[PDB]
Amino acid sequence: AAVEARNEDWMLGPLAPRRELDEITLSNGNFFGSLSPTRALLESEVSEEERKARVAWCGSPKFLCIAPGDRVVVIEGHHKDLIGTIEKLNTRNMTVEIQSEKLKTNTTVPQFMQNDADKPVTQIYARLPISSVRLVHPLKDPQTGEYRDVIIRELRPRNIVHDRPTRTRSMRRFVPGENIIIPWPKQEPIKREDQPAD
Amino acid sequence: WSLFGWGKQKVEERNKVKEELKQSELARTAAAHAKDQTPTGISLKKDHLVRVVDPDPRSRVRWERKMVIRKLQRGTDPWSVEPKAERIARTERKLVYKTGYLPTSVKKLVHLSRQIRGKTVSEALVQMQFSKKKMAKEVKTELLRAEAKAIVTRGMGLGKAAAAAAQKETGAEPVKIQTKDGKHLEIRDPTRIYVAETFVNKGFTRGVELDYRARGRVFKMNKPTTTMTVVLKEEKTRIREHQERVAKKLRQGPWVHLPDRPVTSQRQFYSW
Amino acid sequence: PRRVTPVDKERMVGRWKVIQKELQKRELPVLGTGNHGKYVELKWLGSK
Amino acid sequence: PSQFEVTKDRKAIKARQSKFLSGEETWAPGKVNAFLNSKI
Amino acid sequence: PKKKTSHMKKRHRQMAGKALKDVTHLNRCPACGNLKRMHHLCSTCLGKLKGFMDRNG
Amino acid sequence: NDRFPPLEPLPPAAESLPSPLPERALTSAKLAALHARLNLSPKIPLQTLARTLVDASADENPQFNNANLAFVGQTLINYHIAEWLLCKYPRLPQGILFSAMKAYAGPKPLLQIARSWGVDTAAVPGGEVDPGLLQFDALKPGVAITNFGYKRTELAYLEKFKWRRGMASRVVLDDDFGDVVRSDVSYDRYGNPDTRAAAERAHAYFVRAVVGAIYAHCGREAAKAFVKAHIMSRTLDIAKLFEFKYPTRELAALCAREDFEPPVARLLSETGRQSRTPVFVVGIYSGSDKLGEGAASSLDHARFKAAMNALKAWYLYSPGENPRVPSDMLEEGAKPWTPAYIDMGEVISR
RNA sequence: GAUGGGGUAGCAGAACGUUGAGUGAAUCUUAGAUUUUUUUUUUAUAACUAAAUAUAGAUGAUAACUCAAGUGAGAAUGGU
RNA sequence: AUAAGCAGCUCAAGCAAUAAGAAAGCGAGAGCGUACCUUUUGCAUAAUGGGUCACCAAGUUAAUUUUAGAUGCGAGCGAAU
RNA sequence: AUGUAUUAAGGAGAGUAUAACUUAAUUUAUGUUUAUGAUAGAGGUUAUCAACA
Ligand SMILES: [Mg+2]
Ligand SMILES: [Mg+2]
Ligand SMILES: [Mg+2]
Ligand SMILES: [Mg+2]
Ligand SMILES: [Mg+2]
Ligand SMILES: [Mg+2]
Ligand SMILES: [Mg+2]
Ligand SMILES: [Mg+2]
Ligand SMILES: [Mg+2]
Ligand SMILES: [Mg+2]
Ligand SMILES: [Mg+2]
Ligand SMILES: [Mg+2]
Ligand SMILES: [Zn+2]
């Protein structure tokens, strides 16, 4: 459609149509310039071979060296070089949410979850795969002595130790080649409560 | 958010999807930014559209580079002229509308398309309202939908008020033309929308019905669906096309009594 | 000694120097594809 | 097509149709159909 | 049939004089002004008057 | 870049110059081919043939351009074509004489001659283009070649209020064809009726400059031979340049001037009278001599056609197909000159 | 100033094309490889020129020579 | 829309490019021409087969026994050590 | 298709965390190595973020 729209605008000029005011496309049900919730959230289940590729730069799907709270930088798409903080991380599809205003995109809301008075289209933060982002961490420059932000291209796990009684796991992450152990981000543990039925 | 993956979740997961839409509605909220959204909630900011309106900038940039070079090769040519098609696209409005799938056949709907062919939208709508055909009700509905997209998206039929003042106040004579079929018309509003082209197309098979016949024979009957495509234009097109047919007839020269018809056979001698 | 490309032909006729200013004025690439990157809409969805 | 329940997109195009015809709004060409660097 | 009918001869049989005739016997209702058929009642005013004579009589 | 080194080496200041340098003409294969395609004498170097392709619109310097070369060649072309028409058709009316000249040495034919030579144009002039291309800028009409006409004091009224302009004065005031005198950049556009006139003008100045180059290097006889080979060799039917108004009165005035008997139209043959396509063959006699004849589908038209053919026969009188020209006496070793026939002038009638 | 020139059954010679393979870890490709179209030229079952449309850097295409065949369809009341 | 075409071939008026340059195509009119295959002494045959289009669909492989050409060795050849 | 290695009784019905399989349908333990692996965090359903034996 973008191939047909670019040509139409080039030929018509002052008669360029107002496509934003047209009806939805029945082939998919989306408005103009609007994505689908499945495509804006990337809720599609991918192959297990694809999951291993999305985190090839940050270890393995079961040994993941990126956590929510890390500042990453986009390296693909229109919003390249955009730096943001991770809010949530989905390990099923290996996607990540960066609540940045520039990453918002129009989305067609389905009607089974919308009142007759609400607007059909809305703007929501778009998810990205982990392969399209890289970690941004400040490292101390040894010769100058000042701290500047750098982009980490690769991460690997280190000092892995399991606890069979508790079925827990604690390890560290470092940058290969330079061997710089990067601390984990401050994560808040889930709040466990005692219910009356317990 | 799928229709089926919406009830198999907990209210905890479902309430967070409602909270996400709530914070999104608050962020969207006098006139400077009010123009950045449509009545349907589509944000007209480049950042929110670039992923759908400009999905492949690597190719659009190279395609534009092609059209720019093609335009300078014509600007440096002293003998270049704007092609006829490129001149009509930027001067004459047009809407190509394809209807939905109607429960009928091509042999049946072809006759309703040929009826509204060449007529104005107002004339065609009146003929569909008083037609004994069952699809005439569908054609009328689809023709009203097409006229709505022609007015909102293309800007057609938006000079009626300015037309009447131009002629009725001035007291001038409107334009008189003659269509390709020879029908004479007197156009007072050059923006009036009319059915320029119309054709029917075959669609997917509605269903299959088994015809059980004598001697234990069974035949499959196909229930058809068909679509109609209408091209709506303004009367400016019929005026231009008429002025061209007139100029072509005036360019063919007059009839002469003694024409200099050529002798086609060549022989290496004189026969007279 | 090498292949004669469309660019060389424009340079011979003199049109190339006019094409550079226009493409540069419109911020379009001259002899390249730019800094935009390849299509990713299908890659991000998991296309193979 | 006569029996399709008119959705919110259809109700929005009918409202604008009355605005352009009445004269409340003056039609203008699109500006977000495609993001061209030429802007022509 | 001995042979398959060609495209020319089947189009003749389908189109020559089989065009749908436009209805030109139309006029306006004297009570509302809507388009109706000549010598016929207005379907809009009929139902409305048919219902008006049902409530108050 | 490293993979695409430049094909023709050029200094960085090349694009800044309006036209390529003279020495560059010695490395262009288009020039060398054009020089041989025209069988030019080796006395004309390539640096000179290159200067004939630079229009004043591409290089404003008095040198490096066509201005002066084209003026000399125009004077030779117009002169050799003028004396040639007055010796082949000494009775041509002045208006028909102007069109005959414009039909041979005008911008239209010279454009066809330049294209007959295989001369391609450059998109935009500059010091980077091939010296073998015709360089000019059709966007600048502020360039005009010097001529021998003057600007009429009533030119403003000639064009606005349709004032009258006579023929006798066009020989002194107007140009050689009877036309009055004095009648960053963006290439995102299309052609124009002005760019076509600027392009057609550039091709004409080139053909003229080639003749001026031959005259400067070879001499006078070489220039006449070139004009006589590429221009006078063309074919033109002058009878098709005639448009008569009341030809029956002009023929009556002709017979009265020459003292011939009054012209009488006579029906030589006819068939189909009272039909849709008759044929009346009318012949106009002055006494017993048949002057002209015309066949048309009407009695009046056949009489007018017969008078027109009688006037053409008078105006298209030719002493010979290849007559002697007064220019032949300049060539030493020529026979004595015999006086040519000088006509009185075209007939002026009501 | 060489000689010869219809052709069924049938015999013989010389080639083209299709698919895969070797040279090939080769050659070329946003300065546009590839694009079932159109077009142009060349004694031409074939290739080539150019145009239009889209946009790939190799799971792409490819000359030449050679190797091997599930290799060439208007005809089987053939099959789908 | 005055006409009795296996719809092709020979001859060919005319129409056809808003413009310098550039005519593909359609074609009035005249003439020649009774599809294809199979099978037959012989088929436009009113003998056989096919509604159209696309795809699938038929001298191959093995062993054995020969011939021609090419080529290795040579009263020896080949195989194997 | 052939070859190599290993092995020497096969199916169905119904049910079940719809990768997880038998009304226990996701049992409970041991040892070793864990990024120089193998080939100093968060996470018990917001689960099974560990492979081998
Ligand atoms: Mg822990
Ligand atoms: Mg039965
Ligand atoms: Mg013979
Ligand atoms: Mg033979
Ligand atoms: Mg192609
Ligand atoms: Mg068959
Ligand atoms: Mg007739
Ligand atoms: Mg028969
Ligand atoms: Mg038969
Ligand atoms: Mg049959
Ligand atoms: Mg096959
Ligand atoms: Mg076969
Ligand atoms: Zn009524």
Side-chain angles (χ1 to χ4, degrees):
Chain A
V3 170
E4 181 272 320
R6 72 189 186 192
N7 189 82
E8 199 77 346
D9 289 345
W10 192 275
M11 304 306 303
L12 304 209
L15 309 189
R18 291 193 69 165
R19 296 182 148 96
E20 62 271 21
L21 303 175
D22 203 340
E23 300 164 6
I24 62 106
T25 318
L26 277 64
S27 324
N28 45 28
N30 296 319
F31 288 77
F32 173 82
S34 300
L35 288 168
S36 209
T38 295
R39 178 151 163 251
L41 299 166
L42 297 184
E43 295 294 70
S44 66
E45 307 283 349
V46 290
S47 63
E48 183 64 59
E49 190 236 0
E50 185 65 24
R51 289 173 80 251
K52 295 178 180 173
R54 288 189 170 183
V55 295
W57 76 268
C58 50
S60 156
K62 275 176 175 178
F63 292 90
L64 196 64
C65 326
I66 193 173
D70 271 318
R71 294 190 309 113
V72 289
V73 65
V74 182
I75 63 171
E76 282 180 358
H78 306 82
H79 307 103
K80 195 181 184 182
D81 302 352
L82 182 66
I83 286 167
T85 311
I86 296 171
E87 201 63 21
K88 61 186 73 169
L89 192 68
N90 182 200
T91 70
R92 308 212 172 193
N93 314 275
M94 283 301 163
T95 63
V96 71
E97 188 178 3
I98 298 163
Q99 291 198 342
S100 186
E101 183 65 13
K102 287 187 176 297
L103 289 173
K104 276 197 169 189
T105 184
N106 295 321
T107 305
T108 309
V109 186
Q111 289 302 299
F112 66 78
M113 51 185 287
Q114 196 184 44
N115 293 267
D116 222 335
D118 300 328
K119 288 179 170 194
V121 190
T122 188
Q123 294 73 53
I124 57 148
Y125 297 112
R127 311 294 210 271
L128 317 170
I130 296 166
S131 52
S132 37
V133 298
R134 291 295 183 287
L135 183 69
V136 173
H137 198 96
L139 303 186
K140 183 178 179 180
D141 184 359
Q143 64 180 20
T144 69
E146 67 253 10
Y147 279 84
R148 81 302 186 185
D149 285 358
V150 306
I151 298 168
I152 318 305
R153 283 201 304 271
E154 211 213 335
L155 289 160
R156 291 184 196 166
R158 192 188 184 86
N159 293 343
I160 301 164
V161 286
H162 289 77
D163 202 58
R164 174 171 282 157
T166 58
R167 307 287 167 174
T168 51
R169 201 277 305 288
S170 90
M171 69 186 184
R172 307 171 96 187
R173 54 181 194 176
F174 76 107
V175 187
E178 314 202 353
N179 302 15
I180 303 173
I181 296 164
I182 288 160
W184 293 95
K186 209 284 184 296
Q187 291 165 99
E188 280 289 327
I190 294 172
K191 172 41 52 206
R192 324 298 264 164
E193 302 155 40
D194 300 357
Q195 312 292 0
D198 306 337
Chain B
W1 321 301
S2 57
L3 174 63
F4 309 104
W6 191 246
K8 291 163 218 181
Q9 324 202 139
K10 310 181 187 173
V11 305
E12 209 214 348
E13 273 95 329
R14 213 174 300 99
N15 284 358
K16 285 163 53 277
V17 176
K18 295 193 262 292
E19 183 226 358
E20 176 171 352
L21 299 172
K22 180 175 81 194
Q23 259 53 244
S24 303
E25 202 282 324
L26 291 161
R28 295 157 66 188
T29 81
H33 61 60
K35 275 232 180 63
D36 294 334
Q37 290 228 339
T38 71
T40 47
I42 304 170
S43 186
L44 303 174
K45 291 182 185 173
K46 185 179 174 181
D47 273 289
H48 303 173
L49 300 158
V50 72
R51 190 162 160 188
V52 180
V53 167
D54 197 15
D56 199 2
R58 186 202 181 87
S59 300
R60 176 194 57 71
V61 173
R62 295 290 304 184
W63 170 88
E64 218 172 336
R65 180 185 170 281
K66 181 177 70 169
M67 308 306 287
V68 171
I69 290 169
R70 184 179 299 169
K71 211 188 297 192
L72 303 173
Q73 292 178 333
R74 294 165 179 176
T76 61
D77 190 8
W79 314 91
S80 55
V81 290
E82 189 170 13
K84 186 186 170 180
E86 310 203 10
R87 175 172 48 73
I88 288 165
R90 61 172 187 80
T91 58
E92 290 178 6
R93 306 171 184 277
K94 185 185 77 169
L95 181 106
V96 179
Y97 178 86
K98 194 196 195 200
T99 68
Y101 301 91
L102 314 173
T104 189
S105 66
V106 166
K107 283 203 222 190
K108 280 173 189 157
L109 194 76
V110 68
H111 291 108
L112 288 158
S113 64
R114 298 185 67 163
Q115 191 178 20
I116 62 165
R117 186 177 297 157
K119 290 178 191 287
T120 63
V121 176
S122 295
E123 289 177 329
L125 288 166
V126 169
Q127 291 304 314
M128 297 291 100
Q129 177 181 351
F130 291 99
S131 176
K132 294 184 293 177
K133 302 301 195 178
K134 186 193 178 172
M135 293 285 103
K137 301 178 63 167
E138 316 302 338
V139 176
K140 188 189 180 187
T141 303
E142 298 282 15
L143 210 62
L144 292 162
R145 286 183 65 186
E147 157 170 297
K149 298 159 77 90
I151 292 162
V152 181
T153 62
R154 300 283 166 163
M156 278 192 260
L158 299 176
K160 187 165 187 169
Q167 285 138 18
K168 293 179 179 179
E169 304 170 1
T170 295
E173 265 304 355
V175 198
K176 291 166 172 288
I177 58 143
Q178 186 177 5
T179 65
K180 180 163 285 189
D181 288 1
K183 183 177 178 62
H184 294 258
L185 308 170
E186 207 264 13
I187 290 159
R188 264 171 285 266
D189 188 8
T191 53
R192 189 170 62 180
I193 306 173
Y194 81 101
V195 183
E197 292 176 40
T198 180
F199 54 88
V200 296
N201 273 333
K202 176 153 71 97
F204 65 89
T205 301
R206 220 194 316 163
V208 178
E209 209 179 340
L210 297 186
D211 189 10
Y212 296 96
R213 306 302 294 262
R215 312 291 189 169
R217 286 193 283 273
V218 191
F219 303 105
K220 293 174 180 296
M221 298 195 299
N222 307 95
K223 314 208 89 219
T225 46
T226 181
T227 51
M228 204 175 71
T229 303
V230 293
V231 186
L232 307 189
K233 295 179 174 181
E234 301 186 307
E235 297 292 354
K236 304 178 192 178
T237 307
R238 292 209 274 204
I239 293 163
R240 179 186 61 72
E241 295 177 329
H242 171 68
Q243 295 166 353
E244 294 169 351
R245 283 188 297 270
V246 168
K248 179 178 180 182
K249 190 79 190 77
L250 220 67
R251 160 163 30 86
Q252 284 181 355
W255 169 85
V256 298
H257 306 79
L258 314 174
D260 265 308
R261 294 207 268 154
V263 188
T264 55
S265 281
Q266 181 173 121
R267 302 177 190 90
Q268 309 309 321
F269 51 73
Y270 269 103
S271 309
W272 56 82
Chain C
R2 60 173 183 80
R3 206 238 312 174
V4 175
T5 74
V7 168
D8 293 317
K9 293 172 197 164
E10 306 276 24
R11 284 176 176 152
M12 299 164 184
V13 300
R15 189 185 294 109
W16 185 243
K17 58 162 179 297
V18 166
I19 289 162
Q20 298 192 235
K21 294 182 70 260
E22 271 283 336
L23 296 176
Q24 291 170 345
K25 185 179 179 180
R26 307 187 187 200
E27 296 106 43
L28 290 166
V30 194
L31 306 179
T33 188
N35 63 356
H36 294 267
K38 195 172 170 184
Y39 195 58
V40 287
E41 302 291 333
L42 294 173
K43 169 181 176 184
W44 285 8
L45 296 168
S47 160
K48 298 126 175 54
Chain D
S2 308
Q3 306 306 328
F4 291 161
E5 179 169 15
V6 302
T7 53
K8 297 188 176 177
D9 65 326
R10 296 271 304 287
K11 301 194 172 75
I13 207 177
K14 294 181 185 186
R16 285 263 201 171
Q17 186 184 11
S18 61
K19 287 175 179 292
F20 292 137
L21 290 170
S22 64
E24 286 184 51
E25 266 210 69
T26 311
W27 189 89
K31 294 167 189 177
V32 297
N33 313 340
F35 297 141
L36 308 175
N37 301 23
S38 307
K39 297 157 186 165
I40 55 172
Chain E
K2 258 275 194 200
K3 294 285 171 187
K4 173 181 172 171
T5 303
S6 58
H7 188 268
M8 176 173 83
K9 293 190 176 159
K10 81 192 186 180
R11 284 286 300 205
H12 277 317
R13 184 187 63 237
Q14 297 160 0
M15 305 299 183
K18 275 64 178 279
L20 268 41
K21 301 182 182 192
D22 289 345
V23 299
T24 181
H25 48 266
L26 304 180
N27 58 14
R28 302 260 175 188
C29 174
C32 71
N34 284 3
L35 268 169
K36 64 180 197 68
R37 256 194 296 173
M38 221 190 293
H39 299 97
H40 289 46
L41 286 159
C42 181
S43 65
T44 297
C45 290
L46 168 62
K48 287 190 178 183
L49 295 165
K50 203 173 185 180
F52 170 85
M53 295 193 289
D54 264 327
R55 315 190 214 96
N56 58 88
Chain F
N1 58 19
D2 54 298
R3 185 155 67 88
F4 297 101
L7 296 177
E8 288 126 348
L10 277 156
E15 290 80 9
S16 59
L17 302 178
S19 72
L21 288 166
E23 51 262 24
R24 277 210 61 217
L26 250 55
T27 76
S28 178
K30 274 183 161 61
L31 274 176
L34 183 68
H35 194 290
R37 189 168 308 119
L38 307 177
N39 277 269
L40 297 170
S41 188
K43 300 171 181 177
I44 303 167
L46 299 171
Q47 293 91 328
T48 301
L49 178 61
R51 180 170 159 178
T52 59
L53 287 156
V54 182
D55 191 8
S57 59
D59 196 328
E60 41 67 23
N61 211 36
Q63 317 182 296
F64 305 92
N65 65 181
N66 260 332
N68 294 323
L69 279 163
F71 177 79
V72 178
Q74 181 167 10
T75 311
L76 299 159
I77 295 169
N78 297 7
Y79 168 74
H80 291 298
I81 301 289
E83 62 181 9
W84 172 55
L85 294 168
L86 292 183
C87 291
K88 187 180 182 187
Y89 303 108
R91 283 179 177 164
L92 277 183
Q94 193 59 51
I96 304 297
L97 190 61
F98 279 136
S99 294
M101 285 270 291
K102 201 183 188 185
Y104 278 106
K108 300 284 174 183
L110 299 193
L111 171 65
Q112 302 181 34
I113 296 169
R115 284 171 171 166
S116 270
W117 293 349
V119 179
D120 309 307
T121 63
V124 61
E128 56 168 7
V129 309
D130 191 318
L133 297 176
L134 177 51
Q135 302 137 57
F136 69 96
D137 194 58
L139 281 55
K140 300 297 184 183
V143 290
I145 193 174
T146 49
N147 53 359
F148 295 82
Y150 299 82
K151 191 192 181 188
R152 295 171 175 276
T153 38
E154 60 275 5
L155 174 54
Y157 308 91
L158 249 58
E159 301 295 66
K160 188 180 181 178
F161 303 109
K162 324 197 306 190
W163 281 20
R164 204 192 104 85
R165 183 181 52 145
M167 264 285 179
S169 64
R170 310 190 185 186
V171 174
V172 183
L173 302 174
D174 301 338
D175 66 347
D176 312 279
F177 314 117
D179 301 356
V180 298
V181 179
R182 293 169 189 177
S183 308
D184 213 336
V185 61
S186 156
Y187 297 82
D188 179 354
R189 65 212 290 168
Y190 286 100
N192 251 11
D194 284 18
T195 63
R196 288 157 171 257
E200 193 169 271
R201 193 204 90 263
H203 289 249
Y205 289 12
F206 158 64
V207 174
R208 291 161 178 163
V210 172
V211 177
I214 298 169
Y215 178 82
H217 287 276
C218 299
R220 152 174 47 71
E221 291 181 8
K224 183 185 174 178
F226 197 83
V227 173
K228 187 166 181 57
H230 295 93
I231 294 168
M232 295 167 53
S233 91
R234 302 172 78 75
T235 172
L236 176 61
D237 193 2
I238 308 191
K240 292 173 180 169
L241 299 169
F242 282 82
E243 199 274 337
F244 297 92
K245 203 213 176 83
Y246 301 114
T248 57
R249 300 176 188 171
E250 185 168 20
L251 183 61
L254 177 68
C255 299
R257 196 180 67 175
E258 314 301 334
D259 187 2
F260 306 152
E261 286 287 359
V264 179
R266 297 174 182 279
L267 205 64
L268 313 175
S269 197
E270 53 157 325
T271 191
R273 196 195 280 255
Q274 315 207 155
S275 192
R276 173 169 190 255
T277 51
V279 178
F280 302 97
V281 183
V282 177
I284 292 168
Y285 290 67
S286 61
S288 51
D289 311 288
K290 184 181 171 189
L291 308 183
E293 175 246 322
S297 283
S298 323
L299 284 166
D300 276 9
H301 284 198
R303 191 173 93 257
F304 308 150
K305 190 174 176 296
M308 287 193 265
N309 289 341
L311 293 161
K312 290 181 180 188
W314 172 269
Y315 291 130
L316 295 174
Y317 159 78
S318 198
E321 193 74 8
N322 315 277
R324 289 191 75 198
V325 187
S327 172
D328 294 349
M329 301 302 297
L330 298 176
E331 173 262 334
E332 199 48 293
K335 309 104 76 183
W337 179 252
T338 48
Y341 172 74
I342 297 165
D343 182 21
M344 301 159 44
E346 63 179 308
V347 169
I348 314 173
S349 54
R350 183 164 57 91

